[PDB]
């Protein structure tokens, strides 16, 4: 019935493609990132998703069991599929914390991101809140309290820490309570995000200067199309959104009937995920284009007002549509006065604003708060959207934590030493203790590090290992014969070609290009808030942050080879 299709939708719609995708799309030039993603969907999404589902269905085991049955000296990869998930559980729930925060500041008539606080004389606005938008000031100062540079970090902020603790308690409560009731929840926890995004698209397309954002998002600029970072980010994002590498897909496929259809399931899941991500990006970039157009209008208005006040002009004589000509006339009238303010005049254009209006790990929150503050009944829409985002985050965290606990649940030694219900509490406590780092003054920088590198190389390496093992280790012909015996209609030559030498080759080529780019540039830099300019400035990563990122990647990458060496020694 339609319940199965709704369950597939719920598995496909998650916090990943709704929150992470718009920020990546804006970072990498919009269309110049959207084109690879689709290309990275028909090549790496559907084939690898179907391979994972088929492996899970055929093996009738968990992730560790499935990757141990195929080959002994490869079973360590099953441990790796845990480690990455662990790191995800380290930081992903932090997102929910922010949601909680942004929910709790939604029951006030003067919304905290609606009106800028006064300087103190009760006559003007804060310099940071004047240079930056109200939403950006609320996000970067009253929510994260971010420090200008990663080198200087303060103590653990108590309010974000409390929000994170609340998020972890909610996750633990959901773990203890729900195990099989989701069948009812799927009737409601799967269609609400689509309704919310429909409402926000309705609002966004009614805003002035909204189509500029869509035109920017769908424009594939060839200048930035050749950036390897865009391809690598698209690949890691599609792998993170589909759930590849985490091992949850294999665990879910192990619980389904041997005659259950998988090709249709994989294609439907992949296409639904891509379409949902595209729709969310459309809405977010409509709102972002509205913000950029509003900033452009504001800058033109400020320049026009300044020129009118310094040249004794009429209130309406100088407009945006006839600016430069008038300036030229002033250049012909008396350049002595014109040069007195020539450095003061600013050159503002739509392209530059669209490139740098809003950016960072919190593009979704800033953009949607901007959209909410331009509504009719702001509080209701804010509550609905943040509840939807919190529900998506809780569902994704439930899936990830179940994938983490399942190998630990299967541990006979662990189960006989501690109660099964206490392992979840211990995991939640440890994850909260580790994730308390992201609540410092510079915690957002660490969150950015763990959003860029805790899932980039690890997922790609795990997927490459899986496709190599199912490609040549077990034998593609044997796998096809087993699948044909299980269900018939043996794999079409498209799937066999994709699994044989297309996906591994493409992933290896992307990795080589990324490594070469990093080696040649050698300038891995992060964005940092600058209150004086009220913008984002690129700054070089310090040594210790690079060491932390390298260690985080290296543990996940070396989880497999170390266990392979251990198994080889055990054999020898």
């Amino acid at each position: 019935s339609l319940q199965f299709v709704f369950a597939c939708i719920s598995y496909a719609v998650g916090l990943g493609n709704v929150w992470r995708f718009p920020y990546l799309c804006q970072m990498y030039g919009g269309g110049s990132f959207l084109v690879p993603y689709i290309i990275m969907l028909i090549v790496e999404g559907m084939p690898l998703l179907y391979l994972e589902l088929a492996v899970g269905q055929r093996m009738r085991q968990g992730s560790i069991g499935a990757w141990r049955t195929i080959s002994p000296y490869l079973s360590g990869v099953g441990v790796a599929s845990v480690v990455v998930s662990f790191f995800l559980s380290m930081y992903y729930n932090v997102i929910n914390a922010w949601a909680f925060w942004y929910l709790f500041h939604s029951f006030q008539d003067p919304l905290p991101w609606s009106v800028c606080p006064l300087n103190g004389n009760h006559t003007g606005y804060d310099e940071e809140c004047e240079k930056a938008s109200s939403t950006q000031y609320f996000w970067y100062r009253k929510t994260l309290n971010i420090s200008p540079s990663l080198q200087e970090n303060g103590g653990v902020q108590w309010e974000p820490a409390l929000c994170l603790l609340l998020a972890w308690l909610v996750v633990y409560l959901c773990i203890l309570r729900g195990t099989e009731s989701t069948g009812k929840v799927v009737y409601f926890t799967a269609s609400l995000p689509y309704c919310v995004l429909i409402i926000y698209l309705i609002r966004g397309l009614t805003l002035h200067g909204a189509t500029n954002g869509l035109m920017y998002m769908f424009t594939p600029k060839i200048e930035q199309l050749a950036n390897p970072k865009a391809w690598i980010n698209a690949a890691t994002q599609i792998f993170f959104s589909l759930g590849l590498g985490f091992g949850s897909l294999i665990a879910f496929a192990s619980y389904n009937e041997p005659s259950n259809n998988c090709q249709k399931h994989a294609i439907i899941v992949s296409l639904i995920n891509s379409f949902t991500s595209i729709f969310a990006s459309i809405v977010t970039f409509s709102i972002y284009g509205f913000k950029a157009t509003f900033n452009y209008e504001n800058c033109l208005k400020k320049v026009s007002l300044l020129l009118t006040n310094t040249f004794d002009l009429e209130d309406g004589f100088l407009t945006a549509s006839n600016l430069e000509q008038v300036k030229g006339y002033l250049a012909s009238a008396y350049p002595s006065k014109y040069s007195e303010m020539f450095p003061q005049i600013k050159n503002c254009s739509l392209e530059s604003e669209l490139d740098t209006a809003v950016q960072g790990t919190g593009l979704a929150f800033i953009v949607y708060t901007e959209a909410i503050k331009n509504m009719e009944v702001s509080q209701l829409w804010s509550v609905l959207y943040f509840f939807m985002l919190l529900m998506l985050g809780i569902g994704s965290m439930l899936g990830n934590t179940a994938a983490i606990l399942t190998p630990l649940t299967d541990s006979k030694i662990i189960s006989s030493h501690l109660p099964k219900e206490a392992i979840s509490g211990l995991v939640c406590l440890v994850n909260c203790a580790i994730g308390m780092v992201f609540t410092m003054e510079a915690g957002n920088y660490w969150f950015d590090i763990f959003n860029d590198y805790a899932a980039t190389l690890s997922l790609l390496l795990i997927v490459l290992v899986e496709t190599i093992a199912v490609c040549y280790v077990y034998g593609l012909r044997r796998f096809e014969s087993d699948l044909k015996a299980m269900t018939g209609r043996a794999v079409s030559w498209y799937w066999k070609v994709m699994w044989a030498g297309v996906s591994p080759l493409l992933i290896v080529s992307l990795f080589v290009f990324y490594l070469s780019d990093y080696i040649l540039t050698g300038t891995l830099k992060y964005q940092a808030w600058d209150a004086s300019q009220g913008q984002l400035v690129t700054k070089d990563y310090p040594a210790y942050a690079l060491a932390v990122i390298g260690l985080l990647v290296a543990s996940s990458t070396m989880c497999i080879p170390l266990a392979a060496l251990g198994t080889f020694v055990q054999r020898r």
Binding site: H105, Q108, L166, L169, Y172, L173, L176
Partner: peptide, 29 residues
């Protein structure tokens, strides 16, 4: 402080729910 009051209420509700769930689990023991 609207947000602090709402956070306190939500935390109390979550604490009560977790306490009753753990009590039921202990009963399962």
């Amino acid at each position: 402080s609207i947000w602090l009051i709402v956070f306190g209420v939500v935390m109390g509700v979550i604490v009560v729910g977790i306490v009753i769930l753990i009590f039921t689990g202990i009963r399962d023991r």
